[PDB]
Amino acid sequence: EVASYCDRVVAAVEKKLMDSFSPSLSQDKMDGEFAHANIDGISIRLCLNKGICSVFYLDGDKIQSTQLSSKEYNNLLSSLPPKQFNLGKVHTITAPVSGNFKTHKPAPEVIETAINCCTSIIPNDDYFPVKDTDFNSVWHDIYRDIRASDSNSTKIYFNNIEIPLKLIADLINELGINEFIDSKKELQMLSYNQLNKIINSNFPQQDLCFQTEKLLFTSLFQDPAFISALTSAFWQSLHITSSSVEHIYAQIMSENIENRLNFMPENNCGHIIKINAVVPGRAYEVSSSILPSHITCNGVGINKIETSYLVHAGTLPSSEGLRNAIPPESRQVSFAIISPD
């Protein structure tokens, strides 16, 4: 009753509805189930079976419906939430805008659909052991990325609260990450004094809402686990975790070259990091989507590569603690292509 075909809305084009949809994990799943949504006794299952996508309304509660979709399935994929699903191939999502082989950069409605679209998981199997070199670049990586940050190409969230860019810049400075810093060094933490001072100059205001945000941030920025989680999302090769992935990545980088060459002969694009605390001090689930520029054939699009992991409660901020706490074996990687029109 609640959403009888209110989903048939989505499958043929306010969407707070979509985020009920989660990656269907458990073994109670249906066959080919890749997502599910629990809503008003209703439970919607999304299935895939050899390239074809079934929906299971299947629930007034003893009631079951089911259709099969064609390129209404393409519509479905775009209305999906920014989560890592078990689709088959790496999928391609078209932003609303005709392509342009002139422009230096990605259409901003391409940048938008890249941020808000879902990614398909790339099943690792051949997990890489941990090299002694893992995460060495990390400090430097954050330093560079943040300095060239664009407040709308790169955004950082904690439990869905947006931490201001220019506040995390002030953070890393106070922690010691400059050009002059040793890739190896474990990071001295900060004092209540030290960081209380920076959350105040980045919320110069004294609104009542900020006042609570500031309590969290004040006490988050003192957790080692947390600055570990935060800095790691920036390591340049975070997503290179298996041959299976390396295969997809390479296929893509190549397809990017061959396109730039057949369409526009003669970059940077940043990070969307989402960090949530969770039940093991306290442990953090992190997600670091990166948005490299990727030439599609309708013009200049982007390749979203999202990689997520668990920074466990202990974890201390060094290239050492990081590479051990976040072994390749434990990162999960998914791709999307976002192309203009």
UniProtKB/Swiss-Prot annotation:
| Gene Ontology MF annotations | cysteine-type endopeptidase activity
EC class (word): hydrolase
Keywords from UniProt, A to Z, are: Hydrolase, Plasmid, Protease, Secreted, Thiol protease, Virulence
Induction statement: Transcriptionally activated by VirB and MxiE, in association with IpgC, upon invasion of the eukaryotic cell. Induced at 37 degrees Celsius.
A GO cellular component annotated for this chain's UniProt record is: extracellular region
- Which residue ranges does the record annotate as region Tubulin-binding domain? 180-267
- Top-level lineage group: Bacteria
**Subcellular location, record wording:** Secreted
Q: Which InterPro entries match?
A: Cys_protease_VirA/EspG, Cys_protease_VirA/EspG_N
- Note whether Hydrolase occurs among the keywords: yes
Entry's EC annotation:
3.4.22.-
Give the record's GO biological process terms: proteolysis
How is this protein's activity controlled?
A: Inhibited by the cysteine protease inhibitors leupeptin and cystatin-C.
Biological role stated in the UniProt entry: Alpha-tubulin-specific protease that is required for entry into epithelial cells and for subsequent intra- and intercellular spreading. Contributes to bacterial entry into epithelial cells by inducing microtubule (MT) destabilization and the formation of membrane ruffles. The membrane ruffling evoked by VirA results from the activation of host rac1, which is associated with the destruction of MT networks. Creates a tunnel inside the host cell cytoplasm by breaking down the microtubule infrastructure.
Q: Which family does it belong to?
A: Belongs to the protease EspG/VirA family.
Complex and partners: Monomer. Interacts specifically with alpha tubulin, a major component of microtubule.
> What is the protein's given name?
Cysteine protease-like VirA
Q: Which organism is it from?
A: Shigella flexneri
Q: Which gene encodes it?
A: virA
